[PDB]
Design a protein around this ligand. Structure first.
Ligand SMILES: C[S@@+](CC[C@H](N)C(=O)[O-])C[C@H]1O[C@@H](n2cnc3c(N)ncnc32)[C@H](O)[C@@H]1O
Ligand SMILES: OC[C@@]1(O)OC[C@@H](O)[C@@H](O)[C@@H]1O
Ligand SMILES: OC[C@@]1(O)OC[C@@H](O)[C@@H](O)[C@@H]1O
Ligand SMILES: O=S([O-])[O-]
Ligand SMILES: [Zn+2]
Ligand SMILES: [Zn+2]
Lengths: 116, 299
């Protein structure tokens, strides 16, 4: 029944004033992309930064199992778009946020499916 | 200011390759200076971006399911900035394998950890990138001789596992170089030593072999060519520049769907060598890509 909860441990660490995980790999790009959350190539819009996926994954970075059967990673080999205002902590942003399964945008940072 | 400042970097001019200089110490006028990188961009993202921007100007063969292997992909950061740039640059569907002596997290399709000499592959490759380097090779208190170590492996890997028509980009410095690797540059349709504009204050260069012919088209003396390289660097200050990093609109390598054929050595005629030399052909089996790292068992 025991299972290390790295996600909760990092969130609690940030709450205690801990410095965010560094060396997330920021990519050079046009900043004229679709703005979707996780893409095959950098898709940052003017309000985002694109990062190499593996470098923004808590599980990849901490060398721990991915939390799901088969231990698949949704970020490795892809690019994650992070709002520029949250680009100081890409790992924390990916852990605390959810991707819309319909438009592929971050809920609260691009997804407009809930609008009239 | 300099016209070269708007390019991704500077390639060794042809007349410098034709000299017979003696090896001198590398003394860069701009040594110690650092280029101003775009905010939050790592030096190695900038460096690989400029290398890829330059490779875009060459006749690289780019087949479907292109096979790319990247040596020295790790870093003291535990991540692979160069692999992230190669993954961005290469066409979707390209198989990308990377490797390093030390553990690291990667965006490559597969990563092998261990000395490069332990890396074996059943398949041939279309592009080999190496950033392998040991800063301890820089010793100004002893003669600057041709280095073995990982260079011995890279020379054998090119001769045994690079597809005809394939290309290479191998990082060298004043002290991290190999005479046999320069000699092998003569086995390509074209070659150069490329200096990124962001790292122009370093003796670093990428030795680029473009379109492998599997035989010598020109005889190169490696000790003389490294001396020629240092002479060029010593007499041609390169202005540090990040300018090319701001326009990524034409960055992606275009998928050319270059033909892949499995021809025997007896079928490689002058017409085939011409197609290879123009980046219009890749010669290798198109079987499954299988890789492995040898593990020494002891106690
Ligand atoms: C300049 S660092 C590479 C930086 C990396 N390319 C990046 O994108 O940041 C050079 C790398 O070469 C690796 N290396 C040196 N000698 C090696 C060898 N014999 N086999 C494998 N890797 C080696 C080192 O472990 C080191 O990670
Ligand atoms: O991980 C976030 C980040 O901002 O931390 C500081 C540096 O390591 C940056 O390269 C990195 O993107
Ligand atoms: O473009 C001209 C050329 O000489 O320089 C670039 C290399 O790709 C060579 O193959 C090519 O023939
Ligand atoms: O040289 S032009 O690109 O400014
Ligand atoms: Zn992961
Ligand atoms: Zn949505």
């Amino acid at each position: 029944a025991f299972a290390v909860d790295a996600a909760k441990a990092y969130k609690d660490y940030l709450a205690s004033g801990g410095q965010p995980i560094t060396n997330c790999v920021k990519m050079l790009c046009t900043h004229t992309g679709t703005g979707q959350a996780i893409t095959v190539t950098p898709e940052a819009n003017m309000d985002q930064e694109s990062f190499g996926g593996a470098s923004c994954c808590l599980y990849c970075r901490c060398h721990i199992d991915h939390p799901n059967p088969k231990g698949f990673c949704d970020l490795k080999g892809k690019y994650v778009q992070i709002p520029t205002t949250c680009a100081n902590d890409p790992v924390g942003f990916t852990l605390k946020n959810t991707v819309c399964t319909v438009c592929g945008m971050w809920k609260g940072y691009g997804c407009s499916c809930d609008q009239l | 200011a300099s016209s070269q400042a708007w390019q991704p970097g500077v390639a060794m001019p042809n007349l410098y390759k034709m000299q017979r200089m003696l090896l001198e110490k590398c003394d860069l006028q701009n040594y110690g200076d650092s280029a101003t990188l775009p905010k939050g961009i790592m030096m190695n993202v900038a460096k690989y971006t400029q290398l890829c921007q330059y490779l875009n100007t060459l006749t690289l063969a780019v087949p479907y399911n292109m096979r790319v292997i990247h040596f020295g992909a790790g870093s003291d950061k535990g991540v692979a900035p160069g692999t992230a740039v190669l993954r961005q640059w290469l066409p979707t569907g390209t198989l990308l394998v990377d490797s390093d002596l030390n553990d690291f997290v990667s965006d490559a399709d597969s990563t092998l950890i261990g000395d490069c000499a332990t890396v074996h592959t059943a398949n041939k490759w279309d592009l080999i990138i190496s950033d392998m380097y040991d800063p301890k090779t820089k010793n100004v208190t002893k003669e600057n001789d041709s280095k073995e170590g990982f260079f011995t492996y890279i020379c054998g890997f090119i001769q045994q596992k690079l597809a005809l028509g394939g290309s290479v980009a191998i990082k060298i410095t004043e002290h991290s170089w190999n005479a046999d690797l320069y000699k092998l540059m003569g086995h390509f349709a074209w070659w150069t030593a490329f200096v990124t504009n962001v790292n122009a204050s370093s003796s670093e260069a990428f030795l680029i072999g473009c379109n492998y012919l599997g035989k010598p088209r020109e005889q190169i003396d490696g000790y003389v060519m490294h001396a020629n390289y240092i002479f060029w660097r010593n007499t041609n200050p390169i202005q540090l520049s990040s300018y090319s990093l701001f326009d990524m609109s034409k960055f992606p390598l275009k998928l050319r769907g270059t033909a892949v054929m499995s021809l025997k050595e007896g079928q490689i005629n002058d017409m085939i060598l011409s197609l290879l030399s123009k980046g219009r052909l890749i010669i290798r089996e198109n079987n499954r890509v299988v890789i492995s790292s040898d593990v020494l068992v002891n106690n």
